[PDB]
Amino acid sequence: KVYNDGYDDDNYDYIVKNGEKWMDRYEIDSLIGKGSFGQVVKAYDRVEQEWVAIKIIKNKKAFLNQAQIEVRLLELMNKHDTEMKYYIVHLKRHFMFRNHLCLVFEMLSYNLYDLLRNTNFRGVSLNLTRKFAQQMCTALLFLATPELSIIHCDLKPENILLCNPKRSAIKIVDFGSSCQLGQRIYQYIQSRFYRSPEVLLGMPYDLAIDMWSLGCILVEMHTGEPLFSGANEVDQMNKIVEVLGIPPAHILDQAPKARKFFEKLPDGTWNLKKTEYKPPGTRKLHNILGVETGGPGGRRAGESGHTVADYLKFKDLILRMLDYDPKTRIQPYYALQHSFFK
Numbered sequence: 001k002v003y004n005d006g007y008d009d010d011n012y013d014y015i016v017k018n019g020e021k022w023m024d025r026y027e028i029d030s031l032i033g034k035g036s037f038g039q040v041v042k043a044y045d046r047v048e049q050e051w052v053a054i055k056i057i058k059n060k061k062a063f064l065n066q067a068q069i070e071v072r073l074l075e076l077m078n079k080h081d082t083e084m085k086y087y088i089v090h091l092k093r094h095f096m097f098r099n100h101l102c103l104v105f106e107m108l109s110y111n112l113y114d115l116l117r118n119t120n121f122r123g124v125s126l127n128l129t130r131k132f133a134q135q136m137c138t139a140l141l142f143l144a145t146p147e148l149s150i151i152h153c154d155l156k157p158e159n160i161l162l163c164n165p166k167r168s169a170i171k172i173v174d175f176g177s178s179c180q181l182g183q184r185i186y187q188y189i190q191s192r193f194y195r196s197p198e199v200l201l202g203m204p205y206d207l208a209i210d211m212w213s214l215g216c217i218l219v220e221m222h223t224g225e226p227l228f229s230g231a232n233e234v235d236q237m238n239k240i241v242e243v244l245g246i247p248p249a250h251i252l253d254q255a256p257k258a259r260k261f262f263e264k265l266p267d268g269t270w271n272l273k274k275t276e277y278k279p280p281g282t283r284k285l286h287n288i289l290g291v292e293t294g295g296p297g298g299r300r301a302g303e304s305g306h307t308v309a310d311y312l313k314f315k316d317l318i319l320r321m322l323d324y325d326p327k328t329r330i331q332p333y334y335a336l337q338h339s340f341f342k
């Protein structure tokens, strides 16, 4: 009937209660997030005298374990910052409370998804896209520190939170899906819309898959809609093929899952499988962003910094991130030196 003396529920989740005090310290305000791991509560730390976000992990061995891998990666990253000038969310401390591992983060505001909804999925300026773009890019440069070399492995608008509701500073959150570069253990990784070509094709992946996820994240922020909104891996891949073409032959010949989406004709070349979709590479990104037509749906026409010039710098950068070959796909360091950030 009852679980953990009344503090948990069916799902192994702590029952949050308006007003409750923990350890004569954290005045628990309200529930602000929810997922597989457990629940995120808003709370007032009375000692440091501030708001804090607390990530309450479910009372289960499986979630606690993945949560202790998170604590490991956060604490690691945190000691290569100390200033906090690389846009990763800060872990302040962590304690056990009623058999729940709670991770205490700095309090942040809306995530980039809530902002899209705040536009009605019509998106934000290129000037604001650029500021997420620079920050997000500096975070991949940070992660890519060889002793870190951490793959976030599930970047999306709603894993990117604004520090303040009146500033454009951003922070990446949630490192429970993350792991350090290693031999290939896992394959069903990344949220589907932002799933790399290499993942979908079952090839080996590196930090570059985070760059793909940025490329599609960056475009959806300006249009207001996913670039590649797949209902299923087949339909995900087909939408990428619309925009970028068939993947290079030397990549498909390597892929263990090449035949889930394409078929090797007798001659060596590859073509799609009939299942709707524009012919391969005919849904040109130059058009989706409205480079020569006043931006996404003509809504940016006239606005400063939204010229044809401004838009092509944006395009070419987006094309290097959505590069099919994981080794030539642009890296954080040279991405920061692209003209788009002049």
Ligand SMILES: CC(=O)Nc1nc2cc(F)ccc2s1
Pocket: 032, 033, 040, 053, 055, 089, 105, 106, 107, 108, 109, 161, 173, 174, 175
């Ligand atoms: C969402 C997750 O995995 N961790 C965190 N999620 C949040 C959400 C907030 F509004 C503030 C801080 C954090 S930390």
